[model samples]
Target: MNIFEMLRIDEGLRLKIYKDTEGYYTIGIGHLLTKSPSLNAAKSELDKAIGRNTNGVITKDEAEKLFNQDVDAAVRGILRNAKLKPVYDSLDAVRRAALINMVFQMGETGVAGFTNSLRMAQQKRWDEMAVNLAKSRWYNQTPNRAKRIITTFRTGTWDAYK
Candidate 1:
């Protein structure tokens, strides 16, 4: 078989993040996060993506002859994220960012799995939410990420995301 076709078959094209069979965060055509993952590197890579515009599976510019495609859908999605739960907007900016980031990584359903944490958040109990987050299945699975996400909220200050 041709290399392109082989690659295409080998790595199914999924655009969203999901845990691989080996149980590490993964995305897009077999891209796996390194064992000792760092949030900065992951976030930075996301920052550098050229949207859906490249010839490669990653990004592009020349393939499209269309004059424009506005980011209205993007903007609308941003406004419609899981973090938009009724109580979210009432949170402080830092808390809001933290929650949104969590939802971004964990998916709305995954975040919702943190029922106790959500309960704490509903009470505006920030520290307790952090505590609860630290004690979750999510925490045990990815403590590198949990430590800071839980810590920053616990301390009411900054902690690394990974």
Candidate 2:
């Protein structure tokens, strides 16, 4: 399956306003609408897309578009990180998807900050990589998602999704 489909499950589909884990205003499968400079600005843009006042509601169609855009942008950021480029390119496709999933949850900068984990990944030390990945605020904040991503990193398969 594509990353978008997997993310749809990981992020969960929500067409209405909901507080994310950190209590930020989010909509449309984890889209941080609040990240749009201002709520009013976000509202206006969302309104235009759905062709009406959002009233804290979004269409599934628009939500899917937002998810796709978010993942695509995250992938670009992952590829653009100079220090991460070689490590990413060295991985197989499944492991690469795991990297993208990690970046999807934590921003490119956040993932880039995992120096030791990246080093372990570069050396193809899957167990060390998983252990290093668990030593993070990200893992503490969301253990289940962390487990799945770490499993993917180690196994190079969609076994975690099962």
Candidate 3:
């Protein structure tokens, strides 16, 4: 299916998806527990960090001060990047969601920094992307999480044990 179809919002999964996508969780921004006061809070936080005002990015240092090294900063970072959504919208739903979650955990810079992976992905080189995905510092930093995300992105199915 097309990316939009993949990213389609199913009412049955909406709340669960929103909570997973919008809620704050652990990350590497030091040690904080940033909570989303509301959906707007999620958008605003991300916008402040990565939008025009921030010049396309915020550093881990800034994130540490702004959020507790958790999902909040990651989600905020990705949502702030207006350009990425369309690219995200191009992937299969599971791949799109998995990538968002991965990008959320890794930060835009970290995610985009995957030059080889992005290049491969842009070329529709799934196997290479998967291999590169597993070889990055990102994957190294969060082996289990990366593995799970990669599996979902590659196969379009969740590997429960991962």
Q: Which candidate is the best by TM-score?
A: 2
Ranking by TM-score: 2, 1, 3
Query: Taking the tens digit of each residue's C-alpha lDDT, what string does model 2 give over 52-121?
Result: 8888788888898888888888889988899778789999988988888878877888888999999889
Off by over 4 Å in 1: 1-84
Model 1, 35-71: lDDT tens per residue? 3365544444434443443322332231111101212
Which is superior by TM-score, 2 or 3? 2
Give residue 83's lDDT in candidate 1 (0 to 100).
Answer: 47
Cα lDDT tens digits for candidate 3, 77-137: 6667665544565666666667666564456876767777766665667777889889876
Give TM per candidate.
0.52, 0.89, 0.50
What's the lDDT of the predicted structure labeled candidate 2? 0.83
- State, as a TM-score between 0 and 1, how close model 3 is to the true structure: 0.50
Clashing pairs for model 2 are none
lDDT of every predicted structure (CA atoms)? 0.51, 0.83, 0.52
Order of all candidates by lDDT, from best down to worst? 2, 3, 1
